[PDB]
Amino acid sequence: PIMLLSGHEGEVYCCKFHPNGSTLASAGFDRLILLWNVYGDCDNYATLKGHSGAVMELHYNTDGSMLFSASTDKTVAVWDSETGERVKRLKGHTSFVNSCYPARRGPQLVCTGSDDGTVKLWDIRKKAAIQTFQNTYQVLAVTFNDTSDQIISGGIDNDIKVWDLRQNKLTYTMRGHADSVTGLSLSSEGSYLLSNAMDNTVRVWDVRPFAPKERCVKIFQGNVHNFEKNLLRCSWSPDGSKIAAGSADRFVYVWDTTSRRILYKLPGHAGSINEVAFHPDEPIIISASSDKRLYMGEI
Amino acid sequence: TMPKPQWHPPWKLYRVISGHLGWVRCIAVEPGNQWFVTGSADRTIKIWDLASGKLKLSLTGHISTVRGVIVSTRSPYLFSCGEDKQVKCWDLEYNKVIRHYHGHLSAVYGLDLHPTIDVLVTCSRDSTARIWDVRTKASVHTLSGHTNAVATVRCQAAEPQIITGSHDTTIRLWDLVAGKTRVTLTNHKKSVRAVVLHPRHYTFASGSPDNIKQWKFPDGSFIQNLSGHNAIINTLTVNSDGVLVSGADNGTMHLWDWRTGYNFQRVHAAVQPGSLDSESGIFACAFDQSESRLLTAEADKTIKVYREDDTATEETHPVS
Amino acid sequence: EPPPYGYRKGWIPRLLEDFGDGGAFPEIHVAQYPLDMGRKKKMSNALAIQVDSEGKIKYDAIARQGQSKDKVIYSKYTDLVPKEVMNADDPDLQRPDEEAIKEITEKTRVALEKSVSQKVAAAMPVRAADKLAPAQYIRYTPSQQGVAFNSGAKQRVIRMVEMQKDPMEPPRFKINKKIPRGPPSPPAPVMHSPSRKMTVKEQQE
Amino acid sequence: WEDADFPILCQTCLGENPYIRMTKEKYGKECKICARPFTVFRWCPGVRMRFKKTEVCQTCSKLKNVCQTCLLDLEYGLPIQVRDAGLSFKDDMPKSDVNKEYYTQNMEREISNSDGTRPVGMLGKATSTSDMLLKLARTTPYYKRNRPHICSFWVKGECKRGEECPYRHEKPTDPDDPLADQNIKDRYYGINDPVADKLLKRASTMPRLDPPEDKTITTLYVGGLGDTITETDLRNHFYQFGEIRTITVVQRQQCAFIQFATRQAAEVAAEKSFNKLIVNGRRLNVKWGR
Amino acid sequence: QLSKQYSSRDLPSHTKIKYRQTTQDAPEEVRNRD
Amino acid sequence: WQPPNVYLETSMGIIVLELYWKHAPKTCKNFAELARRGYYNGTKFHRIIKDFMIQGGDPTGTGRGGASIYGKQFEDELHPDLKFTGAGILAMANAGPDTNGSQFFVTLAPTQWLDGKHTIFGRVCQGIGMVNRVGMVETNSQDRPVDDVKIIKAYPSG
Amino acid sequence: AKTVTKQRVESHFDLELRAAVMHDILDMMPEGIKQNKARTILQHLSEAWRCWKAN
Amino acid sequence: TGVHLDPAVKEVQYNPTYETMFAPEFGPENPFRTQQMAAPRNMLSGYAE
Amino acid sequence: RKRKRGVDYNAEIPFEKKPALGFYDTSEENYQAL
């Protein structure tokens, strides 16, 4: 079925699954985080509270045991999916922290991209900062590398940047996007990384020990920007088979890794789609849009 | 021809109740089957016991002929409707009117209740029906389109939800939500004063002095005739076993088989002692809830109860 | 008749008789009007003489005048004939299963009661005036698209906001106007059984 | 009462910015024609332009197919009389009080059974846009309509509101001009509206090809041909329009002379092509040869 | 065209519908009974 | 295999169309194989332009269906001198060259505009007054006219 | 749609009685086809009533 | 042909593929329709959403 | 000049109902004067 979900008062910016594929988390302008059950009637059990600013990015851990959520109010937050309660308020960010990423399968460690001009590394236990690479400017998305030893970030200056956690210098800078990059997501290959950018083009890259020195691999057309400049986010499928993107055009764009063909431009929405979520188990799609509700498409 | 009709036993009169002071114009049975209620042209509503035939109670609120009563299956309510253009809701835990539905422009000829939602439908002589909201007394729809008094209305849960027969000789099947006529059936030549719905068959029948006709829901496709009763037909009433009672206005009552349309009995009852013979007439008939008794409300101010005959057989009373 | 295919050169067919059994000559640089073809005619009132899916003349049209296809219109002789449904068994006629009935009840309840609510809120008249809904946004595609107007852009998006009602303001307009009632619906066809005769003696009676 | 989703308005009258902000008022005013209460929508046309308002019911609009405030036609955009004449329509909407209220009631009941998609009635049966209509049509938005009125004060000298004078502090137009007094009621009914008569005289003085005297003058002279045209191209201009009998493409004068086989065919072709047969961008002048 | 006139008798009254309780005669029992 | 007169007795009147294989062998063969194939039964007129065209033969009835006898579609078999100068020129229309499928068109007047974009493949040798009647009928704003006019019988010449 | 109160009890009884009579036979036991004279049967009805009252 | 959707049908309960959703319509466009009668219209002068 | 419904007779067809159209062309028909 289409299964449209509602109950959010303002835009929903972020929607993602339990890494179980059991529960649903969505969040946006309303400054709180709603949860649902993916199966049955797609019903709502819990609501997490506390974040004073807009929830700009929610992120799971790789088991699903604690929840990370970047807020507009200069703070990140980690909470207990067990309870929904705050364990840590990552303060210290000197501006709008938009992006958050918990280290997967490494020591518990977090990279946060913010509007201060720094990327910040934090340990959850110490209540203190680890490292911080002030390049010059706002960083809009951040993701680790599966070694938990490089950190990738995308901002306003269009050159995707990667730092080595040990030498702490600009390890890898990649170029070719015509305007600001808005989204990074590294496939479960640990290798292929996906980049949305409102210049209307999406790109694919690969962080390896050895890469061709110019690793701009695949390129797809279709995404849109407009006077909104909303933050646009992408994802790989669980399999690295289909790329899903949203855009300010009300069209859910589903493409393939293989033939780069347009498998879908699906209508159904009313406002810009900000985030598409793939089920880690199923062919289930969840769209978070600025029309103050969500969609549950089955393909 | 036809396969041959099922054999039904014939009915015999066994009780005659007389306490009204004007024609008896409507009759109804409680859900739980303990009492029935009659409304008469002496402006009272009497409530009788169904086992003994004793009169339990007399309610007097109307200003003229009470032309319809009904008892709601979901709430302890009795809805009555008169020629004073007023429709009433009696609450049967205090025996007093608690609600009145205003807006008809002439006498109200009949009324039915929706079985699942809480609405009322009334038909009147201004040639409209109205769908009332039981709870807020507000008229949610005025079903208009007939061109003469609307003799009768029946409503159902399936679709179409309202059938009205009127004195311009037409039947209309309406939709409740939209509030307008889907189908218009013009097969009758004379006023349609009687309509009935089969309990378990998605079909219905409509009576007129020409002949009774059967129709098939939901768009009213003709099925067959039932002829032989040449009289102004005031009522039709169907049993669950396919017996169909056709009560006329000169007193004569035919009993038919619903499925094949075979008239298996003709009752011509007698008038109460002090009556003229020009005053024999049946205005309403109602089957019991067990569908064993058949009560009739007559123009000689009596209520006659018929029960089935238990000592007859296919060879005593063969089927022609 | 029509000259042969490939040997139809030279002749320009002007009277449709030159068409033989009909046909236009695409290679002939003349506007072929074969069997009343080509010529745009006067706009006449006659409505479309339709024909059924077997080649019958669907006179259902003239009774169905100006009406939807939801209307069921009985206008044929075959509607009068007794269908032989003397069967106690056929599952054709049995009421919808109570689940579908539950669906119809819920839908009806909804529409019914919402219209109730508006009609009774009229009978509140002291309206506990609620706030005006948030400003809506509507995106509008003019029919007159082009760069002559709209500053070359095709769509315009507009912000609807509903104007405040002054609490102390009496009604503004005269409600009570009388007019005769409209024409009814298209008269339905009178499907009777044929009339019989009344002798002179009966009319005497 | 009417109830709408948006106005239905000319692009001229809707404004210039792509982004407009507009207010609705439910049951706000009375249609000057339908006489019944409507919902009234008000928008600011542009910077330093008067706030405009929808001034006619949505049904009174759909019936005659016009813009609820601009009042001009929706496709072409001429006064209602001009469009009616060009469509050769005869609109029979009643005039007296009781008959008009009754007609409005039933027309509204019947337009309730519509799809909200196109005008009701002959306005669908008359959409064959004649070249006269297309020829009179406005081309770019005459946005002088939305400037404010004339300041009685600043016409007498008094508009002491500085530069904020609520009306264009220019010269008042001489009231003798026919383009001054056009009551709304007539401009909707199309009875003696001066702009209609001026535009009709303009359309009568507009160039159209003239017909000859003799029936035997069946050679048609097309002037301004150019040497990018072919004889087969002149054919394709005058081939399926009937039959052509001969074609002389005069290259020593850049013209053409088409002998036809049907007088009405060539007449329709050339008149319909008058200065507007634009094949390969050449202004040919269709006339009847000697 | 909705009036703002009003009536003494159109005030809210009897605003709850009584339903037939468990013992009075609910449609469940009569569904059962013989 | 070039059936001379393919008889398509529509509901609204009889028809039989003569296709010139010498000018249009590919589309003549295609249409004959379709008419003998009987797949055209049920095709509702997907476009009716008054005094311009009648276009039908769509297994969807919407315009995004239709298939040919060589697959989905094939190229056009152009003629130099065959045109749409008059009614009844039976030419399968296409939304792009070399993609002509099941869709069928019938001219109702000179259509010198469709020359070069649709391959004029014959003329209707039966039922031209019926073609005019179907061309007079009132249609909706999507040229799927209010009347669901369909073919009763689709078959070729013997 | 004014109610039936106390000054309109008799006039209303007669309204509805003669509406009923007109429904009753003069349109549902006719076959005085031409013009069933119901306006004259109502005259008979009123006169029968006065004759009742006068014994 | 495979599954296509009716373009005038907007209430679509099936998850359409790219070709299954935006397949182009075959034929010529009616030369008799003005800009107004040619555009997709929910309202009398335009779609509005 | 003050009468509301007077000219409802001599100026216009009082309440005009134009005949329905059926299967024939009524267009060319027109009638004589007195």
mmCIF file with all atom_site columns, C-alpha atoms in Angstrom, chain D residues 55-127:
data_model
loop_
_atom_site.group_PDB
_atom_site.id
_atom_site.type_symbol
_atom_site.label_atom_id
_atom_site.label_alt_id
_atom_site.label_comp_id
_atom_site.label_asym_id
_atom_site.label_entity_id
_atom_site.label_seq_id
_atom_site.pdbx_PDB_ins_code
_atom_site.Cartn_x
_atom_site.Cartn_y
_atom_site.Cartn_z
_atom_site.occupancy
_atom_site.B_iso_or_equiv
_atom_site.pdbx_formal_charge
_atom_site.auth_seq_id
_atom_site.auth_comp_id
_atom_site.auth_asym_id
_atom_site.auth_atom_id
_atom_site.pdbx_PDB_model_num
ATOM 1  C CA . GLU D 1 55  ? -15.710 41.478 -8.764  1.00 0.00 ? 55  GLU D CA 1
ATOM 2  C CA . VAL D 1 56  ? -18.048 38.782 -10.145 1.00 0.00 ? 56  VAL D CA 1
ATOM 3  C CA . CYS D 1 57  ? -19.262 35.385 -9.001  1.00 0.00 ? 57  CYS D CA 1
ATOM 4  C CA . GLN D 1 58  ? -17.428 32.234 -9.992  1.00 0.00 ? 58  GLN D CA 1
ATOM 5  C CA . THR D 1 59  ? -20.594 31.087 -11.755 1.00 0.00 ? 59  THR D CA 1
ATOM 6  C CA . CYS D 1 60  ? -21.122 34.467 -13.375 1.00 0.00 ? 60  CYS D CA 1
ATOM 7  C CA . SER D 1 61  ? -17.571 33.890 -14.626 1.00 0.00 ? 61  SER D CA 1
ATOM 8  C CA . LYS D 1 62  ? -17.778 30.303 -15.844 1.00 0.00 ? 62  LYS D CA 1
ATOM 9  C CA . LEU D 1 63  ? -21.012 31.137 -17.677 1.00 0.00 ? 63  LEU D CA 1
ATOM 10 C CA . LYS D 1 64  ? -19.543 33.802 -19.958 1.00 0.00 ? 64  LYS D CA 1
ATOM 11 C CA . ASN D 1 65  ? -15.909 32.577 -19.627 1.00 0.00 ? 65  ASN D CA 1
ATOM 12 C CA . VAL D 1 66  ? -14.133 35.748 -18.441 1.00 0.00 ? 66  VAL D CA 1
ATOM 13 C CA . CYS D 1 67  ? -11.678 36.920 -15.763 1.00 0.00 ? 67  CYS D CA 1
ATOM 14 C CA . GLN D 1 68  ? -13.435 37.604 -12.496 1.00 0.00 ? 68  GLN D CA 1
ATOM 15 C CA . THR D 1 69  ? -11.967 41.127 -12.210 1.00 0.00 ? 69  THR D CA 1
ATOM 16 C CA . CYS D 1 70  ? -10.365 41.964 -15.568 1.00 0.00 ? 70  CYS D CA 1
ATOM 17 C CA . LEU D 1 71  ? -13.658 40.951 -17.252 1.00 0.00 ? 71  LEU D CA 1
ATOM 18 C CA . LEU D 1 72  ? -11.888 40.323 -20.546 1.00 0.00 ? 72  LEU D CA 1
ATOM 19 C CA . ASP D 1 73  ? -12.064 36.947 -22.254 1.00 0.00 ? 73  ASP D CA 1
ATOM 20 C CA . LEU D 1 74  ? -9.841  34.164 -20.998 1.00 0.00 ? 74  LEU D CA 1
ATOM 21 C CA . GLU D 1 75  ? -8.112  32.905 -24.152 1.00 0.00 ? 75  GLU D CA 1
ATOM 22 C CA . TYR D 1 76  ? -7.950  35.917 -26.472 1.00 0.00 ? 76  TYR D CA 1
ATOM 23 C CA . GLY D 1 77  ? -8.729  38.752 -24.115 1.00 0.00 ? 77  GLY D CA 1
ATOM 24 C CA . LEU D 1 78  ? -11.123 41.152 -25.784 1.00 0.00 ? 78  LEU D CA 1
ATOM 25 C CA . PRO D 1 79  ? -14.302 42.782 -24.487 1.00 0.00 ? 79  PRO D CA 1
ATOM 26 C CA . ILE D 1 80  ? -17.164 40.322 -24.102 1.00 0.00 ? 80  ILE D CA 1
ATOM 27 C CA . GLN D 1 81  ? -19.076 41.781 -27.058 1.00 0.00 ? 81  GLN D CA 1
ATOM 28 C CA . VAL D 1 82  ? -16.074 41.495 -29.387 1.00 0.00 ? 82  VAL D CA 1
ATOM 29 C CA . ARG D 1 83  ? -15.452 37.866 -28.455 1.00 0.00 ? 83  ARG D CA 1
ATOM 30 C CA . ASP D 1 84  ? -19.148 37.078 -28.834 1.00 0.00 ? 84  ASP D CA 1
ATOM 31 C CA . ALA D 1 85  ? -19.233 38.635 -32.302 1.00 0.00 ? 85  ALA D CA 1
ATOM 32 C CA . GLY D 1 86  ? -16.050 36.888 -33.395 1.00 0.00 ? 86  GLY D CA 1
ATOM 33 C CA . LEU D 1 87  ? -17.499 33.593 -32.240 1.00 0.00 ? 87  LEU D CA 1
ATOM 34 C CA . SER D 1 88  ? -20.811 34.616 -33.866 1.00 0.00 ? 88  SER D CA 1
ATOM 35 C CA . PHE D 1 89  ? -22.472 33.762 -30.556 1.00 0.00 ? 89  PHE D CA 1
ATOM 36 C CA . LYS D 1 90  ? -25.944 34.846 -29.381 1.00 0.00 ? 90  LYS D CA 1
ATOM 37 C CA . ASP D 1 91  ? -25.931 34.888 -25.579 1.00 0.00 ? 91  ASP D CA 1
ATOM 38 C CA . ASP D 1 92  ? -29.469 34.737 -24.179 1.00 0.00 ? 92  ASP D CA 1
ATOM 39 C CA . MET D 1 93  ? -29.090 35.727 -20.513 1.00 0.00 ? 93  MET D CA 1
ATOM 40 C CA . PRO D 1 94  ? -32.195 37.471 -19.182 1.00 0.00 ? 94  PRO D CA 1
ATOM 41 C CA . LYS D 1 95  ? -32.336 41.116 -18.195 1.00 0.00 ? 95  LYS D CA 1
ATOM 42 C CA . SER D 1 96  ? -35.377 41.901 -16.027 1.00 0.00 ? 96  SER D CA 1
ATOM 43 C CA . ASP D 1 97  ? -35.253 41.265 -12.291 1.00 0.00 ? 97  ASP D CA 1
ATOM 44 C CA . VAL D 1 98  ? -37.364 38.164 -11.720 1.00 0.00 ? 98  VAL D CA 1
ATOM 45 C CA . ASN D 1 99  ? -36.471 36.430 -14.970 1.00 0.00 ? 99  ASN D CA 1
ATOM 46 C CA . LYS D 1 100 ? -32.777 37.083 -14.360 1.00 0.00 ? 100 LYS D CA 1
ATOM 47 C CA . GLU D 1 101 ? -32.781 35.787 -10.788 1.00 0.00 ? 101 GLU D CA 1
ATOM 48 C CA . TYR D 1 102 ? -34.654 32.685 -11.940 1.00 0.00 ? 102 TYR D CA 1
ATOM 49 C CA . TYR D 1 103 ? -32.272 32.096 -14.853 1.00 0.00 ? 103 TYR D CA 1
ATOM 50 C CA . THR D 1 104 ? -29.313 32.522 -12.520 1.00 0.00 ? 104 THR D CA 1
ATOM 51 C CA . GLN D 1 105 ? -30.735 29.985 -10.082 1.00 0.00 ? 105 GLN D CA 1
ATOM 52 C CA . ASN D 1 106 ? -31.236 27.276 -12.686 1.00 0.00 ? 106 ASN D CA 1
ATOM 53 C CA . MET D 1 107 ? -27.976 27.947 -14.523 1.00 0.00 ? 107 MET D CA 1
ATOM 54 C CA . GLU D 1 108 ? -26.202 27.583 -11.180 1.00 0.00 ? 108 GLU D CA 1
ATOM 55 C CA . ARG D 1 109 ? -28.034 24.349 -10.396 1.00 0.00 ? 109 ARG D CA 1
ATOM 56 C CA . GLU D 1 110 ? -26.947 22.941 -13.755 1.00 0.00 ? 110 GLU D CA 1
ATOM 57 C CA . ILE D 1 111 ? -23.352 24.159 -13.436 1.00 0.00 ? 111 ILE D CA 1
ATOM 58 C CA . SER D 1 112 ? -23.226 22.332 -10.102 1.00 0.00 ? 112 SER D CA 1
ATOM 59 C CA . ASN D 1 113 ? -23.239 19.125 -12.190 1.00 0.00 ? 113 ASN D CA 1
ATOM 60 C CA . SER D 1 114 ? -20.012 20.104 -14.008 1.00 0.00 ? 114 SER D CA 1
ATOM 61 C CA . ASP D 1 115 ? -16.329 19.259 -13.629 1.00 0.00 ? 115 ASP D CA 1
ATOM 62 C CA . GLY D 1 116 ? -15.127 22.819 -13.015 1.00 0.00 ? 116 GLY D CA 1
ATOM 63 C CA . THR D 1 117 ? -12.952 22.457 -16.119 1.00 0.00 ? 117 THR D CA 1
ATOM 64 C CA . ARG D 1 118 ? -14.421 24.466 -19.015 1.00 0.00 ? 118 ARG D CA 1
ATOM 65 C CA . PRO D 1 119 ? -17.228 26.994 -19.546 1.00 0.00 ? 119 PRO D CA 1
ATOM 66 C CA . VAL D 1 120 ? -20.777 25.648 -19.712 1.00 0.00 ? 120 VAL D CA 1
ATOM 67 C CA . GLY D 1 121 ? -22.718 25.753 -22.956 1.00 0.00 ? 121 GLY D CA 1
ATOM 68 C CA . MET D 1 122 ? -21.975 27.406 -26.279 1.00 0.00 ? 122 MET D CA 1
ATOM 69 C CA . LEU D 1 123 ? -18.637 28.655 -24.925 1.00 0.00 ? 123 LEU D CA 1
ATOM 70 C CA . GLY D 1 124 ? -17.505 25.112 -25.687 1.00 0.00 ? 124 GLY D CA 1
ATOM 71 C CA . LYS D 1 125 ? -19.449 25.018 -28.947 1.00 0.00 ? 125 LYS D CA 1
ATOM 72 C CA . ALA D 1 126 ? -17.834 28.311 -30.070 1.00 0.00 ? 126 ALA D CA 1
ATOM 73 C CA . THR D 1 127 ? -14.107 27.835 -29.319 1.00 0.00 ? 127 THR D CA 1
#
